[PDB]
Design a protein around this motif. Sequence first.
Motif, short mmCIF file in Angstrom:
data_model
loop_
_atom_site.label_atom_id
_atom_site.label_comp_id
_atom_site.label_asym_id
_atom_site.label_seq_id
_atom_site.Cartn_x
_atom_site.Cartn_y
_atom_site.Cartn_z
N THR A 157 0.72 -1.20 -0.01
CA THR A 157 -0.09 0.03 -0.12
C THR A 157 0.75 1.30 -0.03
N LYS A 158 1.90 1.27 0.82
CA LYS A 158 2.97 2.27 0.94
C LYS A 158 3.38 2.70 -0.41
N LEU A 159 3.93 1.46 -1.36
CA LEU A 159 4.49 1.52 -2.71
C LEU A 159 3.52 2.39 -3.63
N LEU A 160 2.27 1.85 -3.24
CA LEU A 160 1.21 2.39 -4.37
C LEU A 160 0.96 3.79 -4.06
N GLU A 161 0.70 4.15 -2.86
CA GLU A 161 0.61 5.60 -2.49
C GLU A 161 1.74 6.50 -2.85
N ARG A 162 3.02 6.12 -2.69
CA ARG A 162 4.31 7.06 -3.16
C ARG A 162 4.35 7.01 -4.58
N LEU A 200 -0.06 6.47 -7.19
CA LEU A 200 -1.25 6.98 -6.85
C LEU A 200 -1.08 8.56 -7.23
N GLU A 201 0.00 9.04 -6.45
CA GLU A 201 0.23 10.71 -6.53
C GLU A 201 0.47 11.20 -8.02
N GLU A 202 1.27 10.29 -8.72
CA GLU A 202 1.65 10.87 -10.16
C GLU A 202 0.12 10.68 -11.06
N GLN A 203 -0.48 9.76 -10.78
CA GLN A 203 -1.67 9.30 -11.65
C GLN A 203 -2.79 10.46 -11.31
N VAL A 204 -2.84 11.01 -10.07
CA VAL A 204 -3.89 12.06 -9.80
C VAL A 204 -3.36 13.30 -10.70
N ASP A 205 -1.81 13.66 -10.19
CA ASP A 205 -1.36 14.93 -10.99
C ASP A 205 -1.42 14.79 -12.60
N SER A 206 -1.22 13.48 -13.22
CA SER A 206 -1.52 13.48 -14.65
C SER A 206 -2.93 13.45 -15.10
N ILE A 207 -3.59 13.08 -14.18
CA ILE A 207 -5.08 13.39 -14.73
C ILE A 207 -5.69 14.58 -14.73
N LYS A 208 -5.34 15.39 -13.65
CA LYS A 208 -5.47 16.88 -13.60
C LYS A 208 -4.79 17.60 -14.50
N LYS A 209 -3.59 17.08 -15.14
CA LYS A 209 -2.95 17.75 -16.04
C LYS A 209 -3.48 17.77 -17.21
N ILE A 210 -3.97 16.39 -17.84
CA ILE A 210 -4.61 16.27 -18.89
C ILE A 210 -5.97 17.04 -19.04
N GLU A 216 5.94 2.65 7.71
CA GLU A 216 5.90 2.33 6.61
C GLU A 216 7.21 3.25 5.84
N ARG A 217 7.39 4.37 6.35
CA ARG A 217 8.63 5.38 5.75
C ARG A 217 10.06 4.76 6.18
N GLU A 218 9.87 4.93 7.51
CA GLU A 218 11.22 4.86 8.39
C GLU A 218 11.64 3.39 8.54
N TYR A 219 10.85 2.31 8.34
CA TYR A 219 11.18 1.09 8.68
C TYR A 219 10.84 -0.07 7.84
N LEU A 220 9.56 -0.11 7.43
CA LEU A 220 9.30 -1.03 6.42
C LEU A 220 10.06 -1.20 5.13
N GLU A 221 10.26 0.19 4.69
CA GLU A 221 10.85 0.02 3.52
C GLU A 221 12.33 -0.40 3.32
N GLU A 222 13.08 0.15 4.25
CA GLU A 222 14.51 -0.13 4.54
C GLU A 222 14.63 -1.78 4.88
N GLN A 223 13.50 -2.23 5.78
CA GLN A 223 13.47 -3.75 6.17
C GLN A 223 13.43 -4.61 4.89
N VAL A 224 12.51 -4.37 4.00
CA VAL A 224 12.31 -5.19 2.60
C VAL A 224 13.74 -5.19 1.73
N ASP A 225 14.20 -4.05 1.61
CA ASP A 225 15.44 -3.63 0.82
C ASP A 225 16.72 -4.43 1.60
#
Lengths: 169, 169, 169, 169
Positions: free
Chosen positions: B126-131, B134-144, D130-139
């Motif tokens: 979920t963190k991967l998707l959010e960072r 999902l962020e670029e997707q909304v920015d991309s849609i507003k830009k278009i 998510e930011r300070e712990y889980l990301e580094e842990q998978v890496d």
Amino acid sequence: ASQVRQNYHEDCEASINKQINMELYASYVYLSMAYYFERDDVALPGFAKFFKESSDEEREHAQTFMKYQNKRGGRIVLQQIAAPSMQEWGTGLEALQAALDLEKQVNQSLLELHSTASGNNDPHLTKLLEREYLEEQVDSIKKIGDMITKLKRAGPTGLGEYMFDKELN
Amino acid sequence: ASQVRQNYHEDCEASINKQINMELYASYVYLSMAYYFERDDVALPGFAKFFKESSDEEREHAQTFMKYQNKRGGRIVLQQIAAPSMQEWGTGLEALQAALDLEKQVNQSLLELHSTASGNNDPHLTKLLEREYLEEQVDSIKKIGDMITKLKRAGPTGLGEYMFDKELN
Amino acid sequence: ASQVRQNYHEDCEASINKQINMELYASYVYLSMAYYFERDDVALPGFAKFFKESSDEEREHAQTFMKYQNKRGGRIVLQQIAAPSMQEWGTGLEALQAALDLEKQVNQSLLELHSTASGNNDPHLTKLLEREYLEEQVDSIKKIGDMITKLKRAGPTGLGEYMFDKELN
Amino acid sequence: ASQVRQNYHEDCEASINKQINMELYASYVYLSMAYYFERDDVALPGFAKFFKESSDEEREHAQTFMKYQNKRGGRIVLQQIAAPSMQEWGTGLEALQAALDLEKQVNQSLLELHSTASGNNDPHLTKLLEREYLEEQVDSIKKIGDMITKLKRAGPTGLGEYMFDKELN
Ligand SMILES: [Fe+3]
Ligand SMILES: [Fe+3]
Ligand SMILES: [Fe+3]
Ligand SMILES: [Fe+3]
């Protein structure tokens, strides 16, 4: 014969002389176009700059063929350079349409010379044409065709021609 | 399984493989558009550049998912990339409308992927998707959306299209 | 026809569309390999970097053919990009043997395209193939053959594979 | 309560104190390994440098949790840091297998802490994890898995261990 001449057919020598005259004629056409676009009742300085550059490059192209003639031991024979088909070129779009036709006329001539060189088993000459002529000719035809499409989109006449002119400047 | 795999559901692994394909498809669509706008009878260089860049970004998003699959101990399984829905995209407005719909299609799939990861208690995904998505997707849609509005205001055909395309250069 | 088309045979236009798809397929094969070698249970970053670069090169070659279609007034027809049938690439040596087979397959198709262009008296297209495709293809095949020989000398499994991989990074 | 405390559950406060001790314990395990690999009868400086850096990272992660306790108005409770039960770490491969087990153990505890935070509707704490712990842990887990695979390819004893160690330095 020339001390340097080797595998250089007289049909290729003759065709190089024909091409020199054609490149020079094209240079003359674009010179005419260039100053037409600087008339006080035309005043399209982007088009004028585009065709001055075009005129300069055709003249360099003619000189490369003259230099090539000497390199192979052929003899440059210069003929009259015909007057441009028009004094006055009309709209920007009409000048580009004339330039597209001229570029394809030069390209057909270049391709015929390649076929002559190929049939005479002259790989030095086919390499010259592919390297220094056929590539620029194709890019040139593509560029002018693009510009015609953009000008038709912008105008082609009135405010659109004025706005388009600012992109060639 | 992997010496690395921990808390990685096989439904998440499979949805990642689907999303890799979808990103590659989107990249292919945008590549089709980019070279469509370089046709001599289309000649929209700002639109061409915009969609080239969109194509590259999509391939980069696909690669980030492939790296992600390996990070988590899943297995990348590549699928055929479908031919783009169109070969010819019409006007710049019609292509932008197609792009907006594509961007909202991808966004829906990414939100479904977020739902799957949340339902399997996978906060790394979920963190991967959010960072990363999902962020670029909304920015991309507003830009278009902004672009569609601007092009409707300028044109959307003729001189307004010619002028708007300059703004994407 | 396209306002720019001149001396462009329909067979050459169709063959270039065929070739775009094969370069895109090659790109996909090398993309598969690149991330295969980043698996935690493979862990060969030099091979991964080598095949990533190969993937980008093939995609650039595909795009040069697309640009070329447009230059000549042909119309790009994009088709599905098939997935590799076997994405379990094996040892570095097995991936290199697969790469060599693919490079020769692409080389044969490029020579067939050269023969079609030549048969239709298209020196613009034979010039493109010799300069932008056939030279790199022989250099690629030689480089991979060298690598296969070096890896067979070093390894091709165990410590030799470990060390060869490091000289690829 | 603390003048700053807001939406901070006592279970999350207790869990963070638990987690500080486990990061400090991990730090101690990696400190043990780091100087083990500097023994004159071991002499693996690349492994020593790798586990020294791992030790520092774990200590920094412990201190970020201590800072976090204070930010939220919780109270740090420091407990004994147990010594590793087996400080005779063996080959580089055996130490790496121990590291992977430890990294996954820490990762499971971090996910449990994420689940506690989520269950108590603490998005500030899930954001931290998510930011300070889980990301580094998978890496970290991916990096160690890669290393185990590379060392098994190279060695994992004798010259392969010697060479793998040098690429770690
Ligand atoms: Fe010329
Ligand atoms: Fe994306
Ligand atoms: Fe290629
Ligand atoms: Fe830690």
